[PDB]
Amino acid sequence: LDFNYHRQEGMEAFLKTVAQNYSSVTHLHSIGKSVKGRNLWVLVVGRFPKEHRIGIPEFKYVANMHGDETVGRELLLHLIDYLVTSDGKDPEITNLINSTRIHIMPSMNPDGFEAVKKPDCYYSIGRENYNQYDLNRNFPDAFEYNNVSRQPETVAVMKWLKTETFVLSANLHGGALVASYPFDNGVQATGALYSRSLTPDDDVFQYLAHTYASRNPNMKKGDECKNKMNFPNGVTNGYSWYPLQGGMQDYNYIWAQCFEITLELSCCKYPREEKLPSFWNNNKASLIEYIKQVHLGVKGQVFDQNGNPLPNVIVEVQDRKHICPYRTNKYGEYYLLLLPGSYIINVTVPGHDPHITKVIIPEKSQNFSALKKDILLPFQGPSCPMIPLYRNL
Numbered sequence: 001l002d003f004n005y006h007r008q009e010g011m012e013a014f015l016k017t018v019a020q021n022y023s024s025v026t027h028l029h030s031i032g033k034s035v036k037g038r039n040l041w042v043l044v045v046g047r048f049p050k051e052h053r054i055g056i057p058e059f060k061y062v063a064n065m066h067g068d069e070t071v072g073r074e075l076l077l078h079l080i081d082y083l084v085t086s087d088g089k090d091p092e093i094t095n096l097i098n099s100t101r102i103h104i105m106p107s108m109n110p111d112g113f114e115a116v117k118k119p120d121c122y123y124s125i126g127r128e129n130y131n132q133y134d135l136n137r138n139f140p141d142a143f144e145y146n147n148v149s150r151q152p153e154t155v156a157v158m159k160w161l162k163t164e165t166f167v168l169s170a171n172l173h174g175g176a177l178v179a180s181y182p183f184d185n186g187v188q189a190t191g192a193l194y195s196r197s198l199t200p201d202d203d204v205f206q207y208l209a210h211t212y213a214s215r216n217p218n219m220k221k222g223d224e225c226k227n228k229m230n231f232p233n234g235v236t237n238g239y240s241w242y243p244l245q246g247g248m249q250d251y252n253y254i255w256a257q258c259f260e261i262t263l264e265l266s267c268c269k270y271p272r273e274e275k276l277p278s279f280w281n282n283n284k285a286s287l288i289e290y291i292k293q294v295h296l297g298v299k300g301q302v303f304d305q306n307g308n309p310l311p312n313v314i315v316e317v318q319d320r321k322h323i324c325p326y327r328t329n330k331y332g333e334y335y336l337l338l339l340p341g342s343y344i345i346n347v348t349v350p351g352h353d354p355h356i357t358k359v360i361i362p363e364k365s366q367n368f369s370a371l372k373k374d375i376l377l378p379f380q381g382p383s384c385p386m387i388p389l390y391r392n393l
């Protein structure tokens with residue numbers, strides 16, 4: 001692709017075309033429409049695109065939810081191309097594109113983007129959805145009723161997040177240059193008084209933020225954005241930054257069972273075209289190294305003694321119980337991003353004693369797949385109200 005901006009027509013175009021020229025390993029669809037009839041295109045890239053496949057983890061990149069934050073819109077289109085055209089020629093990337101099913105959403109709020117005609121670094125007519133709402137302040141909140149008009153895009157995504165067993169994510173932003181991990185909101189129980197809101201998996205989230213930023217020359221600088229605040233190593237907790245109520249990152253992790261972190265890829269929210277090559281350049285390796293992380297820890301499926309995948313069962317590590325507990329999918333498989341170390345998973349099938357099953361998670365993988373571990377229970381065999389769970393917790 002070319003390195004200029006790609007409003008709706010041309011970006012859409014690109015996509016549809018990538019659709020044709022590479023149908024063997026791509027699939028484009030739409031999880032919904034803006035409040036303006038604009039399309040929420042997603043492009044999946046995988047060995048067998050179009051259908052989740054037991055074993056291969058699902059991965060996404062949502063970007064442009066803030067109208068005016070354009071770098072990510074463009075990085076995702078360009079990431080897209082990279083992958084299709086690297087497929088087959090570059091081995092490592094090919095091994096990856098094989099081993100995973102990558103879904104890309106270049107622009108969750110296109111009405112916002114289109115809206116601005118006079119580009120700018122700190123403010124604009126875009127950002128908010130067409131009803132002036134902040135799409136990253138519009139999701140259910142596990143901390144304090146975010147009673148607000150759920151918007152088309154917000155909803156489209158919620159359902160979409162339901163359509164697949166997404167394992168690892170990251171929604172792109174501009175306006176700062178840092179990688180923010182959860183929770184973006186908090187409670188004393190999580191340590192709001194220390195100006196920090198930690199997750200059961202703060203270590204994997206930290207490792208994940210660092211993964212991405214360590215690979216961004218500037219994001220790594222820490223002392224980078226002028227009119228903005230800066231961070232060390234380019235990573236930070238959401239709360240230690242700014243308690244964010246009703247954000248997608250928190251949602252994905254609470255109710256959607258997947259890990260999302262926020263990538264703040266540019267100081268200047270809507271930079272000049274001439275700068276994209278550089279933006280592509282200072283992010284390339286970071287997008288790839290991040291996606292690649294969808295293979296941390298273990299995965300597998302769970303069956304009863306008649307070798308039948310029991311879905312909806314709870315499978316989580318001994319001391320990592322989630323507010324809304326992680327269950328298996330319709331295929332009874334389970335995915336748990338974890339760091340190198342020895343674990344104990346408690347398989348608790350409804351109305352049963354939790355089943356122990358121990359696993360040592362390697363310490364360097366030679367392939368692009370998590371550790372596989374199937375569970376045979378020695379017997380036989382709705383999510384959570386989207387209401388502030390942690391509050392009264």
Ligand SMILES: *[C@@H]1O[C@H](CO)[C@@H](O[C@@H]2O[C@H](CO)[C@@H](O)[C@H](O)[C@H]2NC(C)=O)[C@H](O)[C@H]1NC(C)=O
Pocket residue numbers: 047088094095098
């Ligand atoms: C990665 O997946 C690709 C799928 O495109 C594999 O390559 C193709 O494999 C088919 C087998 O049905 C061959 O007929 C094609 O010639 C291959 N396409 C080309 C030229 O790349 C590839 O072998 C896989 N590599 C792995 C498993 O690492």
Ligand SMILES: [Zn+2]
Pocket residue numbers: 066069173174175
């Ligand atoms: Zn933003």
